[PDB]
Amino acid sequence: SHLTPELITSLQELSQILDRYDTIVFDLGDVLLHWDSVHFTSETKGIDDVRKMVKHPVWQDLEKGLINQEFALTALSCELETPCSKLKEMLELSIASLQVNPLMVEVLRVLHKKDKQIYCLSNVDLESFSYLYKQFDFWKYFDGIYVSALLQLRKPNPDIFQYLISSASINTKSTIFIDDKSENLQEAANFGISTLKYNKDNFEYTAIEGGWPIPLQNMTPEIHKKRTLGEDYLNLRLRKFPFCKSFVSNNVELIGGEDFSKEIFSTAVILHSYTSLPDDIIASMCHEILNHDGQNKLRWCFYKNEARPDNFPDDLNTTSMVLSFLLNHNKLTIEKIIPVAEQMIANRNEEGIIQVYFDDNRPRIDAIVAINVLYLMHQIGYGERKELKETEAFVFDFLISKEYLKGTRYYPAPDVFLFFLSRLVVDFPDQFEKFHKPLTEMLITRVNCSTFPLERALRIIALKKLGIVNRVDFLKLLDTQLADGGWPVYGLFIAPRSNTYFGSRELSTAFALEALHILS
Amino acid sequence: LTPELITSLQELSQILDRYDTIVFDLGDVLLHWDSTKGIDDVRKMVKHPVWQDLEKGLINQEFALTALSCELETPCSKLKEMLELSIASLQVNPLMVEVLRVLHKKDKQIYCLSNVDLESFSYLYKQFDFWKYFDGIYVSALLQLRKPNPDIFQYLISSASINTKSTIFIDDKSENLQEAANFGISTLKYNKDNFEYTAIEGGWPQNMTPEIHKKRTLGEDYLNLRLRKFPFCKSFVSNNVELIGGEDFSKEIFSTAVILHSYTSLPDDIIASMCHEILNHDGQNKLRWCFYKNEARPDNFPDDLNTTSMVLSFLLNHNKLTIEKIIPVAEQMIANRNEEGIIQVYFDDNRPRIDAIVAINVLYLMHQIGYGERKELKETEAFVFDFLISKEYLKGTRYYPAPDVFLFFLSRLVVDFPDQFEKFHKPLTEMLITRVNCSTFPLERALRIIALKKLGIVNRVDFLKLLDTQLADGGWPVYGLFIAPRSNTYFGSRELSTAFALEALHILS
Ligand SMILES: CC(C)=CCC/C(C)=C/CC/C(C)=C/COP(=O)(O)OP(=O)(O)O
Ligand SMILES: CC(C)=CCC/C(C)=C/CC/C(C)=C/COP(=O)(O)OP(=O)(O)O
Ligand SMILES: CC(C)=CCC/C(C)=C/CC/C(C)=C/COP(=O)(O)OP(=O)(O)O
Ligand SMILES: CC(C)=CCC/C(C)=C/CC/C(C)=C/COP(=O)(O)OP(=O)(O)O
Ligand SMILES: [Cl-]
Ligand SMILES: [Cl-]
Ligand SMILES: [Cl-]
Ligand SMILES: [Cl-]
Ligand SMILES: [Cl-]
Ligand SMILES: [Cl-]
Ligand SMILES: [Cl-]
Ligand SMILES: [Cl-]
């Protein structure tokens, strides 16, 4: 009574079978990649097959992202009685031998051309995944990447299939799944997904009717309540203070902060980033931007006038973010904006980089202000202007040199730079292709690397816009919502000379809710 | 139902005396109050949902005060001043404390169960002196549970092994006594004019027990396998406490002795086999022990009082040596004092050193063999006491860098010989309370869990996070317990980490 798999040995066969499905799921290993596991070094004592490492239960902890490679290797040098330097060696040689499967990468490229939904489902650890993302170039063929170290789940547990089906909204009826390991294929079949076993010299194809029901939700009821509680919390805050409040102090957690609430920038940030604000709040906060007394001829000052220090200039950051939002909500025309954009091009320093302030007496640069200025440039038609070349290069170097790990002049948190960069790169992809992979690669390395809710939320948002599901940061984010539904205050940006952080519970809650939304 | 209002101290004493276990809260029953910009009423802080987060030990006072500062639209500093005055104006309830003293004196089982935040609890533990009457203290911010959720009552019942039939609960909040009654515990509502006694039929039979059992079995199988293959406990060395890049060393007997002394549920075959390693050890010389095996002994490296102390203490405790054979070595240790009278680390007058934790382990053997009151110990004992009170231990000891290791080994001494160490008990417990969850290393979490339990305090925060760092083979990560300080070499194993983690799981089961 065991279901007899149809064998396949002709590309014509493989092709007709694959065409019968809307959605194809690849696993990386074997199907799309291969490598040499055995690797002898100048260390005679110990194991010789990296397979001993990958078969060890500690490896499950690495794949799920619970531990890193240094940790895994330290525990394995003990369990496997092999000098850890030899295992590190072995693991490196195996990684260096990785190559694509040329046949299946071509299948993958074609499937993507025929406008199919394609997902990558792989047990692979964060550090390896980051390296694979850099080394190969089929990732562009995937509609979504589901990696164990980003999920805290792993094949063959049904949990990972259940999260895949739910996350990607998959109709398992029209879904097939290509993998080498049988137990992964059996698990997916009990979910009603048809399987395609990749063998040495053939494919085993089991069509699966399925159509049975799904089990209990990993945390869905939890999530719906926390989202509602956060929404109620934030809508109440913003309806009472549509001019988004801020607090100041000398630390990122704003411990002991005092209420300031006289800068309009936070309001602009919230208008731009949380895409589910009720309409009355958008309008009420939009009203604030326009009537902001620090508007002078379509240029904005950070401060309200009453709070404006002596001789504090308009800045290209407030102005850029505001104009961009106005433009995008049909409250300003490109014709009115372009003259302001032109003042910005006239604000470059000796190195050609557009500067922060509308004031030649206050020369400053900042990578994120650069980014937000370029965003407005491309949004209005200026994307090919020659005067932007040096500014774009400043931002690219900031990324590639990993200089962003030290923060920007006004934004200390590295993920804030990656986040705003990801809006530019994703929203204007033709003009930013060379950024896409180094950006996605930095983000992969940073999954779950900090505890601050807003930072976790930024990484969730950016990686998802770039096609990668970051469930780990998601989970931890839920754990830090407080009982009233809001998240804790966060110092998004600083007055550098005085080391004054600025932030609000509203800022943290808005990005958190957006991150919960984007993975929903 | 309807309570039976009580106002006779003679009746009350016959109600209470009918019960084997009495649970007190803190508010009103034992502690009460008796006498510009925003919120003048602290009522608003405590009724606010954020306050529940503070009570569960999910956030600390600073976090809570910044969040409330915003939600109550009051300057942070004002909220903090108010919070400090309220706490500072707390006074003992003299009648009820005396009831408590007497219930304790009559050998009842008494537990404290309070919704109080970690920092406040920490203050109250130091301020007031009725804690010595409880058999266990169950504070929400350390349980990550809170009244009146049934969870906490289930935790208390199973944690303390309470027969709810013979258990009565004294609280001033109605809803707490209600939930308590759902578990068959008789309630006694405290009003300032009377008591409301409601008897309840108990005796009829928490919520991670399936998971916890699996992790414990997995960890046991792991450690059992390691020690059966390597009864001479292995060790790795490196520059760092996580022994990243460590190399197999495994030529020192101390780790074996530590395992034996510290993890109580080892199987008999493993205890026997590890005991053989301690007895057949190379470095043994006339019932003094050397850290190293001979094959690894550096030139002129002396026997040391720490390995010797732990080993003799273990053999004694396992009837392999008599006090008569040990006492002459103890006398040698008394002959090892430096100019300040402190007992030194090495059997070698040319390697003069002191180490508060080595002192502790020496003092332990001293009290175990009957030397507890020898005058020559006074300075050593004062060394250790100051080392704690001055907070010098936060800098580590010479050979153990982690502060909690000192607190943990001190807690063996203080709790095993309580009459001789009463003045250590409060400052020790107090320090430990302020260090709950202050570090991530599993072994350090394990030590704080054991020490606090031995001192009558359930630390479940560190417990839960400990369960999360077990690896999938059942063992916990390696950890560097002690160092050669001059080369800054750390020693450690997964056996050490896994042994302590399992004892922590056991002591809270
Ligand atoms: C060379 C090297 C890095 C060795 C260590 C392991 C590793 C990450 C190999 C590269 C390819 C890969 C993703 C294998 C497992 O993933 P899968 O879960 O996609 O494969 P499966 O279905 O074959 O288990
Ligand atoms: C996020 C953002 C709006 C960035 C652009 C600049 C800006 C207006 C920042 C807001 C906060 C602030 C007053 C900074 C100036 O601090 P300083 O006076 O210590 O530094 P400066 O001499 O660099 O102005
Ligand atoms: C100033 C301030 C409010 C500080 C926070 C801690 C606090 C509530 C102190 C007052 C008395 C006390 C220790 C109550 C504990 O709650 P219980 O669980 O002992 O009391 P209940 O049964 O009445 O809740
Ligand atoms: C935990 C314990 C057993 C403590 C007592 C002393 C002892 C034998 C420690 C074991 C580790 C060791 C070899 C230290 C050598 O210290 P060094 O040679 O680096 O410095 P020294 O001059 O302090 O010996
Ligand atoms: Cl790609
Ligand atoms: Cl600058
Ligand atoms: Cl910068
Ligand atoms: Cl574009
Ligand atoms: Cl006390
Ligand atoms: Cl010394
Ligand atoms: Cl010391
Ligand atoms: Cl005693």
Author numbering:
A (entry chain B): -1 to 0, 19 to 536
B (entry chain A): 19 to 53, 60 to 229, 233 to 536
Authors' own words:
In this study, we determined the co-crystal structures of drimenol synthase from Aquimarina spongiae (AsDMS), which catalyzes the conversion of farnesyl pyrophosphate (1) into drimenol (2). Crystallographic analyses of the enzyme bound to substrates 1 and drimenyl monophosphate (3) demonstrated that the TCβ domain catalyzes a class II cyclization reaction initiated by protonation, whereas the HAD domain catalyzes a phosphatase-like dephosphorylation reaction dependent on a divalent metal. The crystal structure revealed that AsDMS consists of N-terminal HAD and C-terminal TCβ domains connected by a highly flexible, disordered linker.
Additionally, to obtain a co-crystal structure with substrate 1, we introduced the D333N mutation into AsDMS d18 (AsDMS d18/D333N), which abolished the protonation-initiated cyclization reaction. To elucidate the cyclization mechanism catalyzed by the TCβ domain of AsDMS, we determined the crystal structure of substrate 1-bound AsDMS d18/D333N at a resolution of 2.60 Å. Regarding the binding conformation of the pyrophosphate moiety, 1 formed salt bridges with the residues R378, R380, R425, and R513. The hydrophobic tail of 1 adopts a binding conformation stabilized by interactions with multiple residues, grouped by their proposed functional roles: catalytic residues (D331, D333, and Y427), residues involved in π–cation interactions (F281, F318, F328, F509, and F518), and residues involved in van der Waals interactions (Y319, A511, and P512). The catalytic residue variants (D331A, D331N, D333N,30 and Y427F) exhibited a complete loss of enzymatic activity, supporting the idea that the D333 residue, which forms a hydrogen bond with the Y427 residue, catalyzes protonation at the C10 position of 1. The residue F518 was located near the C4 position of 1, suggesting that the C–H⋯π interaction between the carbocation intermediate and the aromatic ring of F518 determines the product selectivity.44 However, F518 is not appropriate for proton abstraction, and Y319 is clearly distant from the C4 carbocation. Initially, 1 binds within the TCβ domain, adopting an S-shaped conformation.
